[PDB]
Amino acid sequence: FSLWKRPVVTAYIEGQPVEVLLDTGADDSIVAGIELGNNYSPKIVGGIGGFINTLEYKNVEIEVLNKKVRATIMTGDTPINIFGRNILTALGMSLNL
Amino acid sequence: PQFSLWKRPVVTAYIEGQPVEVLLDTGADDSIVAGIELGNNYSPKIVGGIGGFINTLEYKNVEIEVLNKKVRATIMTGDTPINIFGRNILTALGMSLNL
Numbered sequence: 513f514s515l516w517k518r519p520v521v522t523a524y525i526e527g528q529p530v531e532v533l534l535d536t537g538a539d540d541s542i543v544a545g546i547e548l549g550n551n552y553s554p555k556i557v558g559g560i561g562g563f564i565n566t567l568e569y570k571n572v573e574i575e576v577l578n579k580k581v582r583a584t585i586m587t588g589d590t591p592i593n594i595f596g597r598n599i600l601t602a603l604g605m606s607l608n609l
Numbered sequence: 610p611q612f613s614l615w616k617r618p619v620v621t622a623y624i625e626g627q628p629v630e631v632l633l634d635t636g637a638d639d640s641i642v643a644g645i646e647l648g649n650n651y652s653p654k655i656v657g658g659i660g661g662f663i664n665t666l667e668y669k670n671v672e673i674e675v676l677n678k679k680v681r682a683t684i685m686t687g688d689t690p691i692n693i694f695g696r697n698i699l700t701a702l703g704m705s706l707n708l
């Protein structure tokens with residue numbers, strides 16, 4: 513992945529298809545649209561411009577970049593889908609000069 | 610060098626001489642830093658982050674030293690809760706996501 517184009521890929525969370533962004537400066541992962549169930553615990557996340565209320569789920573099956581992992585995911589009203597350092601490390605990715 | 614991502618990819622750079630701590634961000638298009646004054650030509654901008662919009666000022670042709678390399682790039686400055694170097698600077702450095 514060169515950085516001349518946005519690092520956007522397609523991921524399958526519990527079977528649902530979504531286009532996420534590979535974000536190295538995000539500690540967690542927020543996506544919108546997905547319906548994951550009734551086992552969540554509320555969170556408050558904050559970035560540039562303010563805060564966003566999210567619902568947190570643990571151990572969610574994710575298939576992306578030809579790999580299948582289990583990670584924590586947050587659903588909320590975010591203006592852009594993000595896969596942060598938590599999924600990225602679990603997937604084995606690196607940032608190199 | 611290589612950055613595992615178990616910890617935030619944070620580094621020191623110099624915006625026209627002044628040292629600041631920034632985060633390497635692959636999901637952002639532009640770059641924005643707080644607390645610096647420059648003399649380059651500027652124009653006011655409004656960026657929208659993950660939480661809402663923020664008022665800023667954009668400078669063109671600024672000289673930056675990061676990782677022992679020098680580049681002339683575009684950067685924004687305002688009251689941001691975290692300083693970041695977006696993809697406009699990373700590409701000019703030659704960084705890449707590996708797997």
Ligand SMILES: CC[C@@H](c1ccccc1)c1c(O)c2ccc(OC)cc2oc1=O
Nearest residue numbers: 537538558559560636637657658659691
């Ligand atoms: C400060 C780091 C950050 C963040 C992401 C998720 C949760 C908390 C913070 C952040 C981006 O990485 C970003 C990326 C792309 C973008 O597009 C406009 C906007 C962006 O706003 C941001 O606050």
